[model samples]
Target chain A: MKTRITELLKIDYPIFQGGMAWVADGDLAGAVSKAGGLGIIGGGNAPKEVVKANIDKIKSLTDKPFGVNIMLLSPFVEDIVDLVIEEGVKVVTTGAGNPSKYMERFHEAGIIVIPVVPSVALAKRMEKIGADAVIAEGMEAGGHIGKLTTMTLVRQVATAISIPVIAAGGIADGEGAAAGFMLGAEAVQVGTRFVVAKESNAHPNYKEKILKARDIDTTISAQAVRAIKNQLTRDFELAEKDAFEQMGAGALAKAVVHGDVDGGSVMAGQIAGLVSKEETAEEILKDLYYGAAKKIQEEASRWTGVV
Target chain B: MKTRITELLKIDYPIFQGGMAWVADGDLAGAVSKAGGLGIIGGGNAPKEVVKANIDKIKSLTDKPFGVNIMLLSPFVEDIVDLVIEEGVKVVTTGAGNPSKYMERFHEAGIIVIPVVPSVALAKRMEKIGADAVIAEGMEAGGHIGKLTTMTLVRQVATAISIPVIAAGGIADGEGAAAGFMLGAEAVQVGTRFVVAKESNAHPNYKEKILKARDIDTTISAQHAVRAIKNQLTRDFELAEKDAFEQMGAGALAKAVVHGDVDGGSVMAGQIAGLVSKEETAEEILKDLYYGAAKKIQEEASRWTGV
Candidate 1:
């Protein structure tokens, strides 16, 4: 129970809920934290109100240490970071842009700065650049991803770095969680599989989509095509194929939030295939518990150990 | 027990083992068909001898109505088509290039042309071109894929087009087959799942790689940048990234296939691999039957006695 990651986060579990844009609100972060894991609310592409509201909402829900996820592309990222600082957010997960600029602010606020690193080299660089920890996201993860797959990248990063690494991507169950732990990741972060949690703020259509998803339900868009599904994936694909047009993550995210199902975007960790049902955050946590415990016991049984 | 697809193909179950490039061969094809589902040999980029040998091998194993998978992009598409014709192959699935041009040849040869169409437009086009049947592969399928995922694509094609749509991608179990049936597909073509079947010729390393794959185990690269993992051929592919051959040129893909760059080569797979722990074959067909039968039983069970 007392792993390096748990000790660092002061959480009982080694599972981490990914910081989803728009979807990861304060309630989700607080709920995950309350459920003995780590969670971060997405600042998404929002004005100050949305960021401040999420911060306040999470505070209202749980006193447990939680964080705000800020995208560097957010025009109000600096302002939102300031707001998170004001709210005493315990951790910050940044992606789509560099978080190096906020090293001072995060450290001054006594917050743990854990930026999402996709490769081992990036993880090392983040640690060197004053990151308290690094979340090593592989190609199997949803949202903006890095080049190396989870199997190749996570193992490489874990083998190379001494930091408390959180593995993300393609992990949908306790067996996968156990595999991550065995692979040297201190914790695991999940995105697509968590989108259907009762605490999730995804649109009913999106939730329904997740509920109805098969293992092959999700597919990665071309490079920098952040969101998959929705109108944007088709539009992007058409654009890529017909005209060879290029759209980056920001543009894709725009299409996603605009309800451009024709042109909107969705992203899921390859683990989207493992997504089964819609459940309350509490229920999801319970399921995770059973899954994790079962995997741990089963794996432990493989080696000489006390059950 | 019989349906439109079976009536057309003369197969017991409407299951098709997708012809995996470099993997699906006579052993796999024959075993699947012998076990009661249709098996298609990987005619992907194979030379005439390979095709002939595979056809002969399949025929030697079983006199079943197994067919050949042909990529029109292959340099010897004509030769392979002729080989299939000569072998008295009953069916041929074509992709990467237009199959309309050779429809006459296959149809004249008494072979049913089942082209894998990705979009509604392609589905409609194939139907227009007088295809015997269309395998409307959703983006959830493994290998070089079109943009629309299985759900969106399947719904679009199944609803708009008059042809028989066989759902492919990410399906590895009975529940998935059941779901595909529910989605209005006449049949399901499973690729990665079938690649792991006992009869498959996939390398042990390759099988292990897939076995360890999470739902997100696969990623589509070569968008804007020259992305390369730790593989040698991938590095070479990166070098060729700007070349017309590397960037979806006329004859480059065919040549690449002839050279047999299995690893660091593009592998098509659905997201379902994460759900499966091992490869299966006839076992999967049995699961399909279970799925089909159980679903009917469930429907019957749902109707309560007049209470």
Candidate 2:
């Protein structure tokens, strides 16, 4: 459906697949963009060269509009910012830190900058720094998180700023999209549901765990990563509670690439309870757009008598 | 305007005033019931005589439907259960522990049991134990909280059970209530907004703090009590909690409510404090929600049509 986000991003649907590290790659982003929704390639800890390769690969698959997520905490962030301009990327979503420093450079290149913010303060600051939009993500989101829930964060951010607000965290279906719109979100960024998407590069075992997940299968670590409850999580909690071996930087890569479930963190949102099976990016996008429309129509029908 | 909650509770609207300790007294409950919504008196850690006195006082004030919230962990829980049956109360909401042990007695008295649950498994269990409905409370809620956010908990609980779901936490306005409905909740229990209601007995300074609250003022403790603002009292509590790694003594909140001990007593409030602006009467609050909700739904319908 058309939203401020759709108009801004030049997409048919106000849907943006989360740029999940290791999972969101060239193939997934291309598939999502081809389906009329804005797709984003996750530039995790990757160097500028690897990030450039993924952007080029996705460009080969789809001429449609797409974006790249820049983890600002990465050591190669400066190089990545330079590469975005060289590669002529149209959109960029940032995380981990403020994007104020790079905003001018991206704006000069006519790139739409959207920052993933976990709090209203950050969202307002981003808007002040000339961000086109801000994705208000709550703690229910996987990976690192902020304290406010999406329901609380989205409305506050939207009310505090004039820019478009995209709600993220715990959004798994069309009903969720409708809920986000009601809470003043112009768009939605979904992660956990897409983890099991056919276009995702996640391991088969990871997908299986998500598909079989119940409401309580996910646990939030002290560091704030929401991972599926597995041996890795069990050990992680113990280490956090007492003295123990600390997981290193390669822990997630080990799980995401080698399927070492016991040593890696399988990040997934709390809405993993609602994700039942694998589907194509096109199918998921259709459900998010059309399904939300239908649900909104039903909700509107309930208020007909009142009006 | 009728939904499962309104129909079941026999109230004109699907709004519920949370059973807040010290704040939700006889006058507050009566005022809310007269305003076309369900009202509840918080029977928190009180003796049977005090609880019965409040119930009787409210009965004298309003001939409409009202209920009592019994903290299941309270020493006076058995007396509260017996008082409910003796008073011929029609509805009861429980929190702090499983109410399964008292369900049979409440059912025998033809009382509808609705527990405030924070997880899908608990919601399902309450339903299985013959609960008429369940309030899915997220961490954004004040007082005691579960790990899940309301946005994630409501839909999961609604989908996992046949009983009606009342969404609680982070809901402060009609827009928030509409969001709850879209997420599959039949009703909404608002705490923070009501804490500032004109009929509420909250300290004047407390109401002022909520009215002036920014989105960042509220903080959830490691023990899960969402405090409204940072005060010298809370700073002292934090030190005590750290020393023991546990919650401080009981009646700390009561001190805040009764004695206006701003720094000494905990001011429990949801993260939605930012949404509550002024002190309005209970009737005005209900009317604002219904009218604002209809406008929001219509706005949503127009957005969908734009799609």
Candidate 3:
């Protein structure tokens, strides 16, 4: 399915696999973009070489357009920005901090700049600074979140800015994606579901925990990151030295890279129950886009369809 | 907007006005039902006479059908059940406790029974016992929330049961409602927004407070509790006196909702309170939700293809 996002990003589908910290990597994103959706590599405080390698890997895997999610606070941020432009990456989605400083240069390189906007004011500020689009992640979403959640936040951003909005958080399937469309999102960005995709390098134990999650399983820590609740979650306390995010990223790496489902943070969304099976990235994108397209009503027929 | 819910309940639209205690009254509910949605009187620990009065008033106000929400924990539970059947009410939405004991009588009275279930087990159990439908409420809802949320619970219950499902909590506008439909909700149950409706008999201060609410202004209390806007009332409850907790909350809702005391009363509202800033008549609110979703669903659908 095509929307402004598809047309602008040159992707066949109107979905984006979230640049999940530690979890999203080249293989996962390549499978998605190759499957018709825009795949993204999460550049979380990683050095230039790591990002360059993943960008290089995705390019080898698929000629289709893919993006790199840049955490603006990364100390390697300057290098990541330079690398993406130098490597000719087509799109860049940002998070954690403002992307204004790098916006003009990104556009000069013919890259689409979309930022994760947690506040309506931030969305407009990004739009004013000429962001290509904004991603509105709701409170029900996993990982870092703002005060207002998705059910309310999506529409607020849609109402506040003219730039296309990508809805994220708690979206695991096409049905939720369709709901995002109804809320005025031009596209959908999914995270937790894709982390469990067959191509995702996240540990088997991490994937298994997400797969077996119950509806009431996830909880938001005081630091504003969402993860499946466990003994770790109940005992979570902010570290005194490192920023919570830096500390949390290490935990995220352990969950995904080391398969520590309990001892490590099994970062995920509230819709974990919907993710039951492990499918290929291609299958996940196919099912989600088509499912959402099917659910988006052309008329008042959905009512009768269910009955 | 003709769905199984509309057909089952004989309403024009698939929206149900939450039966808010002290806030939802004859005029408000009558206006909602007369405007094509289901108007329900909330029976929150009220005596049968109060329920009887609203029933009588709604009947005189509109020839259209309406329901009553009974907090089964009410001491008047037995009386409320008998009262609805005696009044020949068309529908009954229940909460707080299981309604299995009253189901046989309700069905025999030709009354439609839809229970608000917080968990999948309860939803399935209600369906098994012959509930006409289940309202799957997420944690973001205003009054009486469960651990699961609307995004996950609605879809989970819909998949788990053959019965039609209604989505509740965290829903404020057409976009949110549209999202619910995508999540497999046969209809929606709205509360917080209506508390500020033009037709609502709630204290002007109550409505004003909702209009001025911020994104993170709400908080939750004990008992897997109801979400409400924060004030001194909620702050005091944090002291954790088991007796004071109940004592503080016992009739504080009436003070907050009816008596206009924001500091001392329990101002029950959803996290979406930030989205409901304007005051519109129930008819206008209902039309806006139904028509806005209708318009956006088509508008958004036009952008997608392949399905």
Candidate 4:
């Protein structure tokens, strides 16, 4: 499928594999890039060396364009920012905080900047500050979330901004991608589903947790995050009474690397219930690209009463 | 559009004006039905005489199809049920409880039964017990809400049930309606938008609250989970006593709806209240939603290439 998103990013499909930390390794990103989607490496507080290695690995694996997602809240965030510029990555996706200060430098280096926003005002401001596009994520997302849902956020932001909008959260399939597009999103960011892809380097047990997840398996925290409920979440529930400066610090790595699904944070969206299988990155991309397109046309004709 | 929803309901559009209590009335519902969409009288806790007068008024105003939503929590539910059967209403929607026990009587009376559900399991059960359709409502909706958002609930429930799915919540305009249609909903049940329709008898101040409200202005209640625009009453409800004023339980909504008591009573509305910019006739509202939905759905086809 083609749109302004595909035309601007020069990707085969209007889709992106979510740059989730710990789970979004270079090998997985490379596999998705080769499969004709924008695969991005998650630079979650990793120092310069680790970020450089993943960038180097992706460059070696595929000639297709790829992106680097930087967490602005990271302590090493500045170091990773400079690294992406020096390495000359094709695009950069950001979350956790604003990335406006680095706009000019990244634009000078010919890199497209796509920031994730939770509200219309943030998106409108991002467009004015020279952002190429915005990923309008909703509360249905795993990890950090916002107040609105994908359906409301994308529709409101799309009307409020001039740039492209990539909808995220509560989307684990092609039908969801189609729905996002119908909501005025030019593209979609697939996060929870990609975590279960065979190319994903997440712990095998963690993938099992996602595969077996139900509709109500996930819940949001008072601290502003959506994740699968577990002992750690229970701890968070009680943590308000106690404390948590270090409790959730490395919890993601615990579940993703050590396979501690219950004790660690098994981060996944409400759509985790829909992801019941493990497929190759190529299969996932093909299905999402082709699947969303088919549903769009089929539903359109049904609405129009055309054969 | 000529989808299963329109065909089954014998309406011109795949749309239904939400049966909001203390807001929707005979004049409003008649206008919607006369304009070619299924208009429903809100069967809140009103006694038999109130409901009968509305049915009588609507019957005189329009010969087209219409519906009556039964708030099963109402003490007058049995009376309303027998009332609808005697009046020979075309459609009946239920919320606030299980509708299985009355399904046989509804079907025997040649009335269509559509239950409002919050989860996939509820929708599936409603289908198994012979519900003609189901409205999958999310937390973004006003009044009683569920835990999930429209984006997740509609998508999950759409795939689980074979019957038609009518999505509700977080939809105030045609763009949001288009998104619902693409997410496997045969139709959409719009709530917040119609609250400000010109035909709506809501006090001018009540309509003004919806028009001026922001996306974040609405809040969910602590006890009954009724969503509304936050005012002095809600603030007091949060920081103050638990059962200090059980007498004003539902009297608050009516006080706000009729008397325009925004500060002291609950101004029940959905998260989509911000999207309601102005008041329009029910015919204009239905036209904008249906035709605009058609235009947007067709435009999506142009954005994507065939799979």
lDDT of 2 by residue, B1-307 (tens): 6788888889988999988878889988999998889899999888999989899999999999998999876889889989999998999999888889888888889999999997888888888878999999988887888888888999798889988999999987778889999989888898888888888888997788788887777776645355456676567666777666234545677877877776757777878887788999988888787777779989889867855
For model 3, report the TM-score of its A chain: 0.92
On TM-score, the candidate that comes out on top is 2
Residue B86 Cα positional deviation in candidate 3, in Å, after optimal superposition: 3.4
The reply for model 4, stretches above 4 Å from the true place, is A239-246, A305-307, B241-250
Locate the minimum summed-lDDT window of 10 residues in model 1 chain B: B298-307
Ranked candidates, highest lDDT first: 4, 2, 3, 1
Question: Which candidate number has the best DockQ?
Answer: 2
Alpha-carbon shift of residue A196 in model 4 (angstroms): 0.5
**What is residue A281's positional error in candidate 3, in angstroms?**
1.0
Candidate 1 lDDT score at position A168: 77
Decreasing TM-score order of the candidates: 2, 4, 3, 1
For B1-307, candidate 4 gives per-residue lDDT tens digits of 4778989988888889989887878998999999999999999989999989999999999999999999989999999999999988879999988999999999999999999998878888999999999999988888988888888888899999899999998887777887887678889999888888898999999999999987778887765778999899888887655434575565898889999998988898987786788989999888888777778778888766455
- Each candidate: what lDDT? 0.66, 0.85, 0.84, 0.87
Better of 1 and 3 by DockQ: 3
Number of the top lDDT candidate: 4
lDDT of 1 by residue, B17-102 (tens): 88766767888888888887888888877799988888888888887678688877678788887787887888888877688888
Q: How far off is residue A3 in model 2, in Å? A: 1.5
Model 4 Cα shift for residue A171 (angstroms):
1.5
Candidate 4: give the clashing pairs.
none
- Indicate the residue-level lDDT of A242 in model 1: 61
Off by over 4 Å in 3: A72-79, A100-110, A234-249, A297-307, B214-216, B221-224, B235-247
Tens-digit lDDT track of model 4 for A1-307: 4679899989887889989888888989999999999999999878889989999989899999899999998999989989998998879999988899989989999999999997777898999999999999988888888787787788888888889899998887777888888788888898999998988999999999989888878988765888888888888889865647466778898999999987788889999888899999999998887888888788777767421
Which wins on TM-score, candidate 3 or candidate 4?
4
Which lDDT tens digits does candidate 3 get at residues B4-109?
Answer: 9989988999999988888888989999999999999998889999889988888899999899998977888889888988888889999877889989988989
